[PDB]
Structure 1
Amino acid sequence: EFDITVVIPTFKAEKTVGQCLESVLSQQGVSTEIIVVDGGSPDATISIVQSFSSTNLTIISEPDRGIYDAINKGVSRAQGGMIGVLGADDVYKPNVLSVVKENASRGVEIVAGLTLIDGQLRADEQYRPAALISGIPFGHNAMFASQEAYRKVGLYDLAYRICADAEWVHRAIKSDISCRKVEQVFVEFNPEEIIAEACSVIQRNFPFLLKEEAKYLLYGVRGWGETSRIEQILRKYGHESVLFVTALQEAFPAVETAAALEHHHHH
């Protein structure tokens, strides 16, 4: 019954939840359902959320196991054609929801836009196998996914408290979920732990990789580290997976002559 469902997880968000919801309620040209999944805030959050138009607004307020648990509860209740997730410190830009509706009209399963972070565009990557040796290719809050996308991919993996968004998108890529990237800003707003989860997520695509080899690939694609061992890694594991060969030749087009050699002998 709704073009869009916006899932907003909140805990102690009294400072910004107003600005967040104003960015959703003011969206013109769409029927929007809002599901606020609050983890039991003791501050003004519940009152502020209640100060908005409640017509299509549901409030869940109960303990949960973290951000992605709250997101899962909201996604599970969503009735909209496309489902977005907005943090309480985030805002959608004007007209974004209508842009999502328009770009979804042919049945694409994911519609993703750009993200503005401290006045700079997030350095996004393409939605393609090459993302599988990296992080999430677009900002998770700039992503909208259909009911069928979530039905087919499933829910967010709570084992990942940082990078569950990346792991979900990688599962989408591996499931050949369709995606359309829109070159418009949709949303504005312990490294060792982040790196550990990101390596783990990459290894869930390619279980033959050592953690250090997942790290090398990740730093390689992101431009944080050198790439002279990429060909070595390709020769080491190319026989394991055509997807992995495809990912490396997409991420590092210069290894094409070596990639074709892997394809030719094993795939």
Structure 2
Amino acid sequence: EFDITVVIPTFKAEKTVGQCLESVLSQQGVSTEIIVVDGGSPDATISIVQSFSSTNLTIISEPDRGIYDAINKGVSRAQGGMIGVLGADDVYKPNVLSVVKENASRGVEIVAGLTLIDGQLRADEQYRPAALISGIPFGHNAMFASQEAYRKVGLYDLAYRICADAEWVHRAIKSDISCRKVEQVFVEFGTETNPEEIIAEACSVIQRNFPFLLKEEAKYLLYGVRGWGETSRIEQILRKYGHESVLFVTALQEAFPAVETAAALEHHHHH
């Protein structure tokens, strides 16, 4: 019945939620359901949401355990073939939902696009093992995933208050969920937290892929691949742990091509 469900978590969003909804409702070539999951907004948010056509829009209004619990509630009730998550201060660009529908018609499970943030493209990485030593490879709000993808991977892990999006995409990579990256802007991400908290979660996510890593080693790899830190110890880390996991060797050789000759040795010794 619906090609797309858009889940919109809202909290005190009266300034932007109208623009957000208009960017979904104007999408051509698709049948769309909207599920607004509101976190208890005491402002005009509810009034503004109810000003739009209500036929294919549901508001879920109940207590939550943070934004990812709200997202999970919406994903669980989605009826659309492909499911997107759009923040209440984000907007989709024109014709994006038709692109998702067309590429999903061929059976692809995740369709993701580019993200515009403060006038610059998000520095995306590829969906591949090298992402498993980093964060989420594309912006989460530029991602659409099928009903089957959500069934296979599961829901967002509420232990991660910030990086549950990355942890979900990493689970998808590890489960071989299919993904198409489209090189056009799908979302303009609104920009209106303690960085140490973000770092701690990001390192924990990486350790969930590679549990042999110390926290400081996960941090070194993340900073290396993102271009935030040095890379002179990568070969040492590869020799320390290459025996543990062929996937780890593959991730480092993809992320740091300069260690290809050392990665070839790890494959030769153990894999």
Q: Across the two proteins, how many residue pairs are aligned to each other?
A: 267
Displacement of 1:260 in angstroms is 1.1
Partner of 1:246: 250
Q: Write the deviation string for residues 37-81 of structure 1: whole angstroms up to 9, x where unpaired.
A: 111211111111000111110110111011000000000001101
Q: Write the deviation string for residues 156-193 of structure 1: whole angstroms up to 9, x where unpaired.
A: 00010000000000000000000000001000021101
User: Secondary structure of the residue that 1:225 maps to in structure 2?
Assistant: coil
Q: Write the deviation string for residues 85-107 of structure 1: whole angstroms up to 9, x where unpaired.
A: 00001000011101111121110
For 1:186 and 1:140, locate their aligned partners in 2 and report how far apart those are by CA, in whole Å: 11
For 1:153 and 1:235, locate their aligned partners in 2 and report how far apart those are by CA, in whole Å: 31
Q: Write the deviation string for residues 106-134 of structure 1: whole angstroms up to 9, x where unpaired.
A: 10000000000011000000000000000
1:264 and 2:268 correspond: yes
For 2:96 and 2:53, locate their aligned partners in 1 and report how far apart those are by CA, in whole Å: 19
Displacement of 1:265 in angstroms is 1.1
Contiguous gaps of at least 5 residues in structure 2? none
Which piece of structure 1 moves more, 158-167 or 255-264? 255-264
Displacement of 1:82 in angstroms is 0.4
For 2:45 and 2:266, locate their aligned partners in 1 and report how far apart those are by CA, in whole Å: 55
User: Secondary structure of the residue that 1:34 maps to in structure 2?
Assistant: strand
User: Secondary structure of the residue that 2:206 maps to in structure 1?
Assistant: helix
For 1:238 and 1:213, locate their aligned partners in 2 and report how far apart those are by CA, in whole Å: 14
Partner of 1:138: 138
For 1:88 and 1:67, locate their aligned partners in 2 and report how far apart those are by CA, in whole Å: 12
For 1:240 and 1:53, locate their aligned partners in 2 and report how far apart those are by CA, in whole Å: 55
Partner of 2:149: 149
TM-score (norm 2): 0.98
User: Secondary structure of the residue that 1:108 maps to in structure 2?
Assistant: coil
Q: CA RMSD in A?
A: 0.6
Displacement of 1:254 in angstroms is 1.3
| Runs of 4 or more consecutive aligned structure 1 residues displaced over 3 Å after TM superposition | none
Displacement of 1:138 in angstroms is 0.1
Displacement of 1:247 in angstroms is 0.2
TM-score (norm 1): 0.99
For 2:242 and 2:2, locate their aligned partners in 1 and report how far apart those are by CA, in whole Å: 45
Q: Write the deviation string for residues 199-239 of structure 1: whole angstroms up to 9, x where unpaired.
A: 00000000000000000000000011111100000000000
User: Secondary structure of the residue that 2:42 maps to in structure 1?
Assistant: coil
For 1:18 and 1:208, locate their aligned partners in 2 and report how far apart those are by CA, in whole Å: 47
Which piece of structure 1 moves more, 97-106 or 121-130? 97-106
For 2:256 and 2:227, locate their aligned partners in 1 and report how far apart those are by CA, in whole Å: 11
Alignment of 1:1-267 (within 5 A): 1-189=1-189, 190-267=194-271
User: Secondary structure of the residue that 1:113 maps to in structure 2?
Assistant: strand
For 2:53 and 2:142, locate their aligned partners in 1 and report how far apart those are by CA, in whole Å: 23
User: Secondary structure of the residue that 1:2 maps to in structure 2?
Assistant: coil
User: Secondary structure of the residue that 1:80 maps to in structure 2?
Assistant: coil
For 2:220 and 2:126, locate their aligned partners in 1 and report how far apart those are by CA, in whole Å: 19
For 1:260 and 1:77, locate their aligned partners in 2 and report how far apart those are by CA, in whole Å: 47
Displacement of 1:240 in angstroms is 0.5
For 2:150 and 2:159, locate their aligned partners in 1 and report how far apart those are by CA, in whole Å: 18
